């Protein structure tokens, strides 16, 4: 459980349990990155698959269990960490061991250019963009789309 | 100011070929116009932007979106695309990674799917059954640019 992975200049914490992360520090990173509130009891009610957090908690990728394919629940990068390559670092380390992935994004999310560039697939809905990597089977994709549709939002306000 | 053509014989072909080759900076494979079943083409009067829809399965297939760099600056490509969309509610098309129009395609599409090294885009399809048919047509369709 838990260790550090280098990506170029940067060092990244890989954790498979919330117990191995500084949760108050991680919540502050997420809420500061999105300028929104995480729903109450987020860590307690979210089944972690793997989290990747930069050593100094300036960027994070959180994968969770939502059906058969790993679900990217949060990609948080501090605005103040911009240009340092930190977001790309945590994303890259995650992708190296996560060949299949899906996630969702609001239409106005500042990360969307990055998501278009990185994703293999995309499905547009009225209020969400659904993205995936590594999925070819159309039922798997359909199930991922349904999971995004049915999953309550965990960023509010 | 936009030509709408349902047969190749109503277009200036070496001219259209020159537009296509300038836009893509690649060569249009020999015998393109005679082995490509036209559905309809929208071509700017001075052949600086074109949208070519062809017959490839049940859904209209956008085979070529060719716009000169300066025409793209002027928004002419977007204008021709808009004219096409007003009478073409359903369509699919494909692109490679370096395609200058990808940002536009990401914005215009209702989705995309990667097969081989193509991204296959669609508009106006929402059922995965329809989407699956379109992707299948792109797979065994050879490139027309070299
Ligand atoms: C990738 C990522 O951060 N997904 C978050 C939030 C996206 C958003 O608010 O637009 C999600 O669960 O969809
Ligand atoms: C939409 C469109 O013009 N497709 C072109 C170009 C594809 C590419 O090489 O990127 C085609 O020949 O299918």
UniProtKB/Swiss-Prot annotation, chain B:
Listed transmembrane segments: none
GO CC annotations on file: cytoplasm
BP-aspect Gene Ontology terms: L-arginine biosynthetic process
Predominant place of localization: cytoplasm
Keyword Cell wall biogenesis/degradation belongs to the record: no
Top-rank taxon, per record: Bacteria
N-acetyltransferase domain ranges (all copies): 3-146
Keywords: Amino-acid biosynthesis, Arginine biosynthesis, ATP-binding, Cytoplasm, Kinase, Nucleotide-binding, Transferase
Compartments reported by the entry: Cytoplasm
GO molecular function: acetylglutamate kinase activity; ATP binding; L-glutamate N-acetyltransferase activity
The keyword Cell division is assigned to this record: no
Family: In the N-terminal section; belongs to the acetylglutamate kinase family. ArgB subfamily.
This protein's name: Acetylglutamate kinase
Organism, scientific name: Xylella fastidiosa (strain Temecula1 / ATCC 700964)
């Amino acid at each position: 459980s838990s260790g550090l992975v280098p990506r170029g200049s940067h060092m990244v914490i890989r954790a498979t349990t919330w117990k191995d992360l500084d949760l108050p520090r991680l919540q502050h990173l997420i809420q500061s990155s999105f300028r929104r509130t995480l729903i109450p009891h987020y860590f307690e009610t979210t089944p972690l698959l793997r989290a990747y957090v930069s050593e100094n908690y300036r960027a994070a990728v959180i994968l969770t269990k939502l059906g058969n394919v790993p679900y990217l629940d949060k990609f948080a990068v501090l605005d103040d960490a911009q240009g340092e390559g930190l977001g790309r670092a945590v994303w890259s380390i995650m992708r190296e061991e996560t060949p299949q992935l899906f996630w969702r994004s609001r239409h106005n999310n500042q990360a969307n250019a990055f998501y278009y560039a990185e994703s293999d697939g995309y499905y547009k809905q009225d209020h969400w963009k659904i993205f995936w990597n590594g999925l070819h089977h159309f039922q798997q994709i359909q199930q991922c789309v349904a999971h995004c549709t049915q999953h309550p939002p965990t960023l509010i306000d």
